[PDB]
Design a protein around this ligand. Structure first.
Ligand SMILES: Nc1ccn([C@@H]2O[C@H](CO)[C@@H](O)[C@H]2O)c(=O)n1
Ligand SMILES: [Cl-]
Ligand SMILES: [Fe+3]
Ligand SMILES: [Mn+2]
Length: 495
């Protein structure tokens, strides 16, 4: 018998330094930090030779250190961490697939990705579908895959032109088959399912896709999943497969210890822990911290600039309005100008709280990190209601809306029949009426399954002018945070 230890993360989302989470110790205790995670993994690797560290994608995008470097800083920091293999998540595409190739080429650790291809081609996007990593005489085959639904749902259209993910189940079984007689254990790092709830609290999230995947293939030992940000405090067992995940952002790190007795694909679980990382319990790895610090110094000049103030922490919600959604929608509306009647933006695009006090450029970027450009268009009331119904389905959260738009839905009704009321400036939205709206390019191209945006007429896109520019400009124009932004339930579940 040999201890075989697998440590894993997913959806780290550029949370390179320790930070507060409103629902952990009431936002009063720092969690995570990648230098802390480095210390954890280094200590485990020092204790047992047969120890692997894996990540299931979405290390890009969150705190400004990612967006402002197009993920370059993130690869540099990860190069100081002892990863044995990672896969590619949707967020690694956020600055375009050419940037994906460029940045990830700089990784000093293996990256596996076996089901993204050039459209109308058999050519693979990445060059390595799986790899074998041997430690202390034990060989682990590691496969990387992205779910097709998740890829189409969450990769911005503008960043995936000419590439696509293909049937993840077909490829998973193929790679399991190719590895079967070559390895002791087969692990898949799969980025798939429903996107994470983005909330300061609020919409049920689970790992149903991953259970389905495990039930559909034969011979997979371990399935480490990312995308949903739903941790597995105990492994989910499906046949002989164990499904593992974390709560994202380095809030916790999973550790699985197996008893392996030299019979390939046969093992028992010795111990499992999904451990919450409290910064005050860890010594940060000095090399990782040094690389983070160097990047912060480079970016400081730009990010430190004060752009606004708030009397209270600004929050987000996935199933209803919250202050950051109200603000962003009002900012898009202001930027579009007086011919525009309303603005809509997505809850999943709002990635962090903004603290009370002086608001800085860095804070705004961390909350609104995406290169999603301002778009104006004309939609009918029927098209608007369709978008509202898609929001109310909660598959991708509700749309956040500008002042004057009010929507009430009831989540206990069937999907597609949940909207109860929908008014603009007190008047019901009407099917045939044309409305002048503002949004951004992720939604305009049908992101998050909001298909009706693609039917908009009289479309105008402002190149290079992103949500965070709109927010900064809202304050530059002399607007402030209002009480109705802080407290207005413009979108509400009345269940
Ligand atoms: N360019 C982009 C790319 C992604 N997203 C948001 O990120 C969510 C997935 O984490 C997606 O569900 C979506 O809400 C975004 O707002 N803009
Ligand atoms: Cl999927
Ligand atoms: Fe994802
Ligand atoms: Mn993610």
């Amino acid at each position: 018998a040999k201890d075989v230890t697998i440590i894993y993360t997913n959806d780290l989302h550029a949370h390179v330094e320790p930070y507060k989470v409103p629902w952990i110790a009431d936002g009063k205790r720092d969690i995570g930090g990648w230098a802390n995670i480095t210390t954890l993994v280094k200590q485990e690797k020092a204790k047992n030779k047969a120890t692997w560290f894996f990540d299931a994608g979405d290390y890009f995008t969150g705190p400004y250190i990612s967006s402002l470097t197009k993920g370059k800083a993130i690869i540099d920091i990860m190069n100081t961490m002892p990863f044995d293999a990672v896969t590619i998540g949707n967020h690694e595409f956020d600055h375009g697939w050419d940037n994906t190739l460029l940045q990830l080429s700089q990784a000093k650790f293996p990256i596996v990705q076996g089901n993204i291809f050039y459209q109308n081609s058999s050519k693979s996007f990445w060059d390595k579908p799986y790899t074998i990593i041997e430690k202390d005489g034990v060989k682990i085959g590691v496969i990387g895959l992205h779910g097709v639904f998740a890829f189409n749902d969450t990769v911005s259209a503008a960043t995936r032109v000419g590439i696509e993910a293909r049937d993840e189940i077909k490829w998973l079984q193929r790679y399991i088959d190719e590895l079967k007689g070559k390895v002791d254990l087969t692990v898949a790092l799969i980025h798939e399912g429903v996107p994470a709830r983005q909330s300061s609290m609020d919409v049920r999230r689970a790992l149903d896709k991953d259970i389905q995947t495990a039930s559909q293939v034969k011979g997979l030992d371990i399935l480490i999943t990312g995308h949903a940000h739903v941790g597995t405090p105990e492994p989910i067992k499906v046949g002989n497969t164990l499904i593992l995940s974390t709560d994202s952002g380095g809030i916790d790190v999973g550790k699985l210890v197996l008893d392996y007795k030299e019979k390939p694909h046969n093992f028992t679980v010795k111990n499992f822990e999904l451990k919450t990382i409290y910064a005050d319990e860890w010594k940060p790895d000095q090399q990782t911290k040094q690389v983070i610090d160097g990047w912060n110094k480079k970016l400081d000049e730009v990010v430190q600039q004060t752009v606004a103030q708030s009397p209270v922490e600004l929050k987000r919600a996935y199933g209803e309005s919250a202050s950051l959604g109200n603000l962003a929608a009002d900012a898009l509306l202001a930027a579009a100008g007086k011919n525009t009647q309303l603005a809509l933006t997505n809850s999943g695009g709002i990635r962090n709280e903004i603290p009370a006090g002086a608001i800085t450029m860095g804070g705004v970027i961390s909350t609104f990190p995406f290169p999603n450009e301002l778009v104006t268009m004309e939609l009918t009331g029927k098209q608007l209601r369709s978008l509202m119904e898609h929001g109310a389905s909660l598959s991708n959260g509700v749309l956040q809306v500008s002042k004057g738009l009010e929507m009430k839905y009831d989540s206990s009704k069937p999907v597609g029949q949940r909207v109860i009321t929908l008014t603009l400036n007190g008047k019901p939205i009407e099917d045939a009426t044309v409305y002048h709206i503002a949004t951004q390019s992720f939604l305009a191209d049908g992101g998050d399954g909001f298909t009706a945006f693609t039917e908009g007429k009289a479309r105008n896109i402002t190149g290079g002018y992103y949500v965070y520019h709109a927010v900064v400009d809202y304050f530059k124009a002399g607007n402030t945070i209002t009480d109705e932004q802080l407290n207005g339930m413009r979108v509400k579940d009345i269940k």
